[PDB]
Amino acid sequence: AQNPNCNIMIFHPTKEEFNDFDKYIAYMESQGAHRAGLAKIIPPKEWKARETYDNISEILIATPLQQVASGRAGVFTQYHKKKKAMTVGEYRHLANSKKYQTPPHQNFEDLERKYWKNRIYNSPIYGADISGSLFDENTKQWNLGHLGTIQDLLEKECGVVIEGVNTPYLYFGMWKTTFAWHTEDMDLYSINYLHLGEPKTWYVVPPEHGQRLERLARELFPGSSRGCGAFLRHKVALISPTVLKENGIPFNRITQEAGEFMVTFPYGYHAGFNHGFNCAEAINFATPRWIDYGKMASQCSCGEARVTFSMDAFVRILQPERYDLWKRGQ
């Protein structure tokens, strides 16, 4: 068994190795990368996502989300309050303002301490889930807008043609903007490229221990748990590394910097925060190894969790028994 401690692995593909996405994901897994639930990939020195980021101020964030916290410092829920549209130029200026800017800090460790101590007392604004891409059309390797689709993977493995098209999303962040504990829709993989700006810190639980996190979550958020058997799908629940330690939940942490890829693996619970103004791009993907996770994925049928048009087909084909109840749920 490779990577039995489930450590987060960091990869440095050569230009040649960076030419076949599926092959390299399979290679990473042959080294046990998936057992951590998250891997970092540093692209070849000669590679670039696009020429410059000089002309991105005019992107619209149609619905910025103010992330409002309830609970205690290390155990809280966050709800998203919709705000008026703003351009990325306006957003960046807001992120850099005295009210929202990254505070003085010694290092990543000091900033993490400040995040968990102080996060709940501020309400940062997140420009999340914006359909689009910042990869140059001519970028041929690891272009998140040119990956093979989940629908084609499911067709290749199961011999069934289905509707749907999955495309990338942009995320414009500032200090304290947060992603709550979750696995991907249908326990898919995700790939995240940090285009520019300040770092993003990640926490992850190994897939083999995901049910331990779920059990702790039910204990820590009893109301939410009664409401929905898969409430973590709502992406509202935060639990600090201190609280995870106290409860013996195995986990790992790593900081992603601009120019680096992170891949999350099937059923790898993850959460994190942004250090300051930044922009990331992400998309879900699948491999043959995902199919069995897709079949076993928990579903929110309470109506809260956002269902994409594409997920109908995944549930319909992989989870026919669950399909009706899930459908009437939302």
Interface with ligand YC8 includes 172 (CB under 6 A)? no
| Binding site residue list | 126, 182, 184, 192, 200, 228, 234-235, 270, 300, 302
Give the span between the Cα atoms of 320 and 272, in whole angstroms: 33
| Site track for ligand YC8 across 85-124, x = CB under 6 A | ----------------------------------------
Q: Which of 3, 47, 48, 80 binds ligand YC8 (CB under 6 A)?
A: 80
CB of 322 to ligand YC8, least distance (A): 22
The secondary structure of 113-163 as a DSSP string is: HHHHHHGGG---EEEEEEE---S-TT--SS-TTSSPPHHHHHHHHH-----
The smaller minimum CB distance to Fe ion, of residues 133 and 190, is found at 190
Q: Which of residues 132-171 bind Fe ion (CB under 5 A)?
A: none
| Site track for Fe ion across 176-195, x = CB under 5 A | --------------x-----
Interface with ligand YC8 includes 308 (CB under 6 A)? no
Measured CA to CA in angstroms, residue 245 lies from 14, 202, 231, 239 at distances of: 37, 16, 22, 10
The smaller minimum CB distance to Fe ion, of residues 187 and 198, is found at 187
Interface with Zn ion includes 228 (CB under 5 A)? yes
The secondary structure of 273-304 as a DSSP string is: EESSSEEEEEEEE--GGGHHHHHH-----SS-
Interface with ligand YC8 includes 179 (CB under 6 A)? yes
> Of 52, 39, 42, whose CA–CA distance to 6 is shortest?
39
Q: Which of 129, 137, 292, 324 binds ligand YC8 (CB under 6 A)?
A: 129
State residue 148 phi and psi, 5-degree precision.
-70, 145
Give the span between the Cα atoms of 130 and 32, in whole angstroms: 32
| Binding site residue list for Fe cation | 182, 184, 270
Q: Which of residues 212-271 bind ligand YC8 (CB under 6 A)?
A: 235, 270
Tokens of 70: 């309830």
Q: Which of residues 283-302 bind Zn ion (CB under 5 A)?
A: 300, 302
Measured CA to CA in angstroms, residue 75 lies from 92, 169, 177 at distances of: 29, 28, 16
Give the span between the Cα atoms of 325 and 330, in whole angstroms: 9
Interface with Zn ion includes 304 (CB under 5 A)? yes
> Of 212, 246, 216, 218, whose CA–CA distance to 230 is shortest?
218
Interface with ligand YC8 includes 280 (CB under 6 A)? yes
Residues of this chain that interact with Fe ion (CB under 5 A) are 190
Residues of this chain that interact with ligand YC8 (CB under 6 A) are 65, 80, 128-129, 171, 179, 192, 200, 235, 270, 280
